[PDB]
Amino acid sequence: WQENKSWNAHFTEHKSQGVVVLWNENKQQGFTNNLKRANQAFLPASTFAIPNSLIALDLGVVKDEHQVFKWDGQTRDIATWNRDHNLITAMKYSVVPVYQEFARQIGEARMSKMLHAFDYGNEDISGNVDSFWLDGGIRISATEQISFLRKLYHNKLHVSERSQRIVKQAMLTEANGDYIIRAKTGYDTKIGWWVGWVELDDNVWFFAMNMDMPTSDGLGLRQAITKEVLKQEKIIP
Amino acid sequence: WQENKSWNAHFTEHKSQGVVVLWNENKQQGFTNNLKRANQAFLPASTFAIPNSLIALDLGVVKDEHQVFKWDGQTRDIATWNRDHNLITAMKYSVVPVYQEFARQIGEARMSKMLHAFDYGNEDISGNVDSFWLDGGIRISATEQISFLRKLYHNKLHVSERSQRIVKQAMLTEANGDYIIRAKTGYDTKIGWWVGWVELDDNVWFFAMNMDMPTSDGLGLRQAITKEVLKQEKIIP
Numbered sequence: 001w002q003e004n005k006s007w008n009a010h011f012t013e014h015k016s017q018g019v020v021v022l023w024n025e026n027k028q029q030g031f032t033n034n035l036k037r038a039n040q041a042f043l044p045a046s047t048f049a050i051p052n053s054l055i056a057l058d059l060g061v062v063k064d065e066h067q068v069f070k071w072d073g074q075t076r077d078i079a080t081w082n083r084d085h086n087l088i089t090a091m092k093y094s095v096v097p098v099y100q101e102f103a104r105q106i107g108e109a110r111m112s113k114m115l116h117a118f119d120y121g122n123e124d125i126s127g128n129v130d131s132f133w134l135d136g137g138i139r140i141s142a143t144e145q146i147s148f149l150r151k152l153y154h155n156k157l158h159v160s161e162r163s164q165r166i167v168k169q170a171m172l173t174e175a176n177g178d179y180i181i182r183a184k185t186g187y188d189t190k191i192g193w194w195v196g197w198v199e200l201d202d203n204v205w206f207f208a209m210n211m212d213m214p215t216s217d218g219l220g221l222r223q224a225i226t227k228e229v230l231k232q233e234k235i236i237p
Numbered sequence: 238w239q240e241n242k243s244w245n246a247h248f249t250e251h252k253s254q255g256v257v258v259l260w261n262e263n264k265q266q267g268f269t270n271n272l273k274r275a276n277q278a279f280l281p282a283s284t285f286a287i288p289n290s291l292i293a294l295d296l297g298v299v300k301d302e303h304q305v306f307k308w309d310g311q312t313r314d315i316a317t318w319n320r321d322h323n324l325i326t327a328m329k330y331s332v333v334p335v336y337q338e339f340a341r342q343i344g345e346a347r348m349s350k351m352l353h354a355f356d357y358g359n360e361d362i363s364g365n366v367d368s369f370w371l372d373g374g375i376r377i378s379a380t381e382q383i384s385f386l387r388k389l390y391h392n393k394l395h396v397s398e399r400s401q402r403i404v405k406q407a408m409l410t411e412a413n414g415d416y417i418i419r420a421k422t423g424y425d426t427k428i429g430w431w432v433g434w435v436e437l438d439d440n441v442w443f444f445a446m447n448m449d450m451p452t453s454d455g456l457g458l459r460q461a462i463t464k465e466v467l468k469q470e471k472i473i474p
């Protein structure tokens with residue numbers, strides 16, 4: 001692990017504070033602007049969609065990425081949530097009601113065992129079984145996110161290969177002739193997350209970033225700052 | 238099937254001739270500029286990478302999308318071919334040597350049975366087992382490409398679900414916040430292909446296009462004309 005404090009400019013240029021963590025898979029080397037904050041554990045918020053979806057698929061709670069989760073008919077504040085969804089759109093729009101239903105069907109006992117088998121963060125599900133990743137005791141650091149994501153990328157998590165492939169499909173965020181990004185955003189009113197990886201022809205760069213997010217206005221800085229770092233390191237054009 | 242002859246402008250604006258075929262999956266309705274050419278059968282050329290990769294995966298010739306196919310050390314004219322590849326980069330760069338090795342290992346008997354089970358075009362593998370899709374008797378029309386691709390999208394081809402998922406991953410071409418394109422190009426010195434689909438939040442639009450391609454200079458018209466049609470029909474922004 002190498003600390004590049006010159007990456008701090010990418011945060012300070014946006015009047016922001018946070019951490020970007022990168023992992024070169026071929027070289028087995030990591031880079032970050034702040035080693036300490038790279039290892040600071042936060043609530044996963046909507047980034048918990050990745051383990052949650054994996055467990056739900058492996059237990060049969062979700063059949064596949066096409067299966068429709070009917071809206072319960074409760075109107076909530078996020079407009080995108082009040083409609084039918086599948087695994088793809090649930091991940092795209094961070095539809096909490098869907099993932100809460102996942103967690104309830106999974107149950108406390110299976111959820112706890114699965115997160116331990118996943119070596120996921122602090123592995124603590126204290127709180128409501130359907131809201132612990134939002135207001136409970138589970139915490140995960142950026143380096144721990146990358147550890148988890150590396151296992152997912154290689155199909156080495158303790159779930160079926162099929163479940164991992166489907167979740168990685170649902171993680172699809174951006175793709176062009178130069179790279180593929182599979183990733184998941186998160187925002188809990190205090191900090192914003194972006195965790196995932198960049199697939200290249202001959203390598204994969206894993207990333208996990210978080211930053212202080214006082215207001216929603218700057219949510220796009222999550223991706224912008226990350227991509228500005230990736231471009232500086234010549235990972236993407 | 239509805240013929241929209243006003244789509245011909247998209248070809249004539251580029252001094253080109255060809256066909257675009259679209260299929261609205263939710264409505265089960267098709268649209269094309271030229272119904273006749275939509276049903277004209279051509280050599281699949283590099284679009285055969287999709288059935289070939291499916292068969293190779295299902296027979297174990299390819300383990301997964303990470304498995305490296307070592308370059309044989311024969312230098313060929315296409316620079317991208319003279320290197321190691323996996324299933325992702327073989328599809329991206331249309332690396333014929335890889336697919337020829339696939340076909341040889343598959344063999345004539347299994348290839349012929351598989352294409353019949355796939356209902357793939359004329360189902361004729363006459364010629365060399367490792368070049369029939371380039372210089373042999375196999376032919377497929379744009380509408381037949383869409384018929385095949387619909388089965389792939391739904392995991393209804395006569396191969397393992399896993400094989401179909403992996404090939405669809407390898408087909409990934411473009412993705413953003415509005416759509417995902419999974420597709421495959423083809424070019425045989427006479428005609429150019431682009432076949433695939435556009436995934437939206439709530440629908441999928443399948444497409445198959447081909448056009449006369451006297452020279453390589455216009456290869457990019459394949460995607461440009463297709464995307465100009467998609468934009469006209471408000472399928473993509």
Ligand SMILES: *C(=O)[C@@H]([C@@H]1NC(C(=O)O)=C(S[C@@H]2CN[C@H](C(=O)N(C)C)C2)[C@@H]1C)[C@@H](C)O
Pocket residue numbers: 044045046047093094096134185186187188193219220
């Ligand atoms: C989880 O982190 C929460 C949701 N996750 C995200 C997110 O990181 O994108 C949001 S923000 C919401 C969804 N997308 C909308 C948008 O237009 N932008 C990203 C600017 C707004 C949620 C708060 C979950 C616990 O609600």
Ligand SMILES: *C(=O)[C@@H]([C@@H]1NC(C(=O)O)=C(S[C@@H]2CN[C@H](C(=O)N(C)C)C2)[C@@H]1C)[C@@H](C)O
Pocket residue numbers: 281282283284330331333371422423424425430456457
């Ligand atoms: C199959 O159709 C042949 C290859 N397929 C393609 C193609 O449709 O892209 C090409 S063109 C080749 C690969 N990409 C290079 C490029 O820079 N452009 C697309 C402009 C050039 C091949 C001829 C296969 C039978 O060789």
Ligand SMILES: [Cl-]
Pocket residue numbers: 045046047048049094095096099
């Ligand atoms: Cl969530």
Ligand SMILES: [Cl-]
Pocket residue numbers: 168169172405406409
């Ligand atoms: Cl995918």
Ligand SMILES: [Cl-]
Pocket residue numbers: 282283284285286331332333336
């Ligand atoms: Cl080919």
Ligand SMILES: [Zn+2]
Pocket residue numbers: 010013014224225228
């Ligand atoms: Zn900036």
Ligand SMILES: [Zn+2]
Pocket residue numbers: 158
């Ligand atoms: Zn076990």
Ligand SMILES: [Zn+2]
Pocket residue numbers: 247250251461462465
């Ligand atoms: Zn045009």
Ligand SMILES: [Zn+2]
Pocket residue numbers: 395
């Ligand atoms: Zn059978």
